[PDB]
Amino acid sequence: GVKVVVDSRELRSEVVKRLKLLGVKLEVKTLDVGDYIISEDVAIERKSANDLIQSIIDGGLFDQVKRLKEAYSRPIMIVEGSLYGIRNVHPNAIRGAIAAVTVDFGVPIIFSSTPEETAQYIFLIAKREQEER
Amino acid sequence: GVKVVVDSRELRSEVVKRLKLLGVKLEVKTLDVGDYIISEDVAIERKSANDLIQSIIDGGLFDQVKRLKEAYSRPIMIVEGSLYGIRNVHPNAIRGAIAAVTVDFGVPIIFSSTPEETAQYIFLIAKREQEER
Ligand SMILES: [Mn+2]
Ligand SMILES: [Mn+2]
């Protein structure tokens, strides 16, 4: 089976439930950065669409990505939930943030519609990491 | 204004119409690779959700990304349209492809819901490129 380190704050999430159903072996830790660690280089940050939008409003998104990159050489951000129909911010603000993180900071931003899908992504990434290690 | 080179096959698309409304100055060329060129390093490939799925079915997606990377150091792929509810392929096949391109090949995959949104992304990326040149 594949092994993934999970931050304590994620322990009782539906993501963890699906990872367990998928047969993933989890090791719990309290991480200063990241939510799911796949390898010494690959770490995943789970962020809801609402929190992404809030971090854009408060201008804290870039500091968050900076911190991720300084801790892991190959960080990944999974944005969970729909970003559409969510007012309180012009679409260009969301688009601009996405483009900056993925193209400028060079941090992949994979989109997931549910916690189950976030788990499915974590699982397939970890499986590939294990196979090529 | 910002300047973008557009491949001839895109000339009469709704993407081009919006780019023109946004004030972008377009130079038409027949490109061997890429759909919208922003700089010597940044090129954008527009691909509909249906074509993305088809390229996964036919196993041609990776060759396409390879070709993009060999032509431009900083290529970007904009997937246009929803990938959900589109059967004829298991979700893991789509997820796996997305993860491979963005994390392994290191090519950003920005998602757009419409040709207008694809244009909005092209515009903001080009504007930033111009400002920092
Ligand atoms: Mn998180
Ligand atoms: Mn295209």
Structure-block tokens of residue A68: 């991720």
């004030």: which residue's tokens?
A: B23
Resolution, rounded to a tenth of an Å?
Answer: 1.8
Interface probe with B: pick from A84, A92, A112, most Cβ of B within 10 Å: A92
């909005």: which residue's tokens?
A: B120
Task: Out of B98, B104, B125, name the one closest to residue A110 (CB).
Answer: B98
Q: Report the distance separating Cα B24 and Cα B80, nearest Å.
A: 20
Find out if CATH 3.40.50.1860 is the number for domain A1-133: no
Task: Out of A84, A92, A109, name the one closest to residue B124 (CB).
Answer: A92
Structure-block tokens of residue A58: 């408060």
A60 touches B at CB < 8 Å: no
Check chain B for breaks (C–N over 2.5 Å) and list the residue before each, or none.
Answer: none
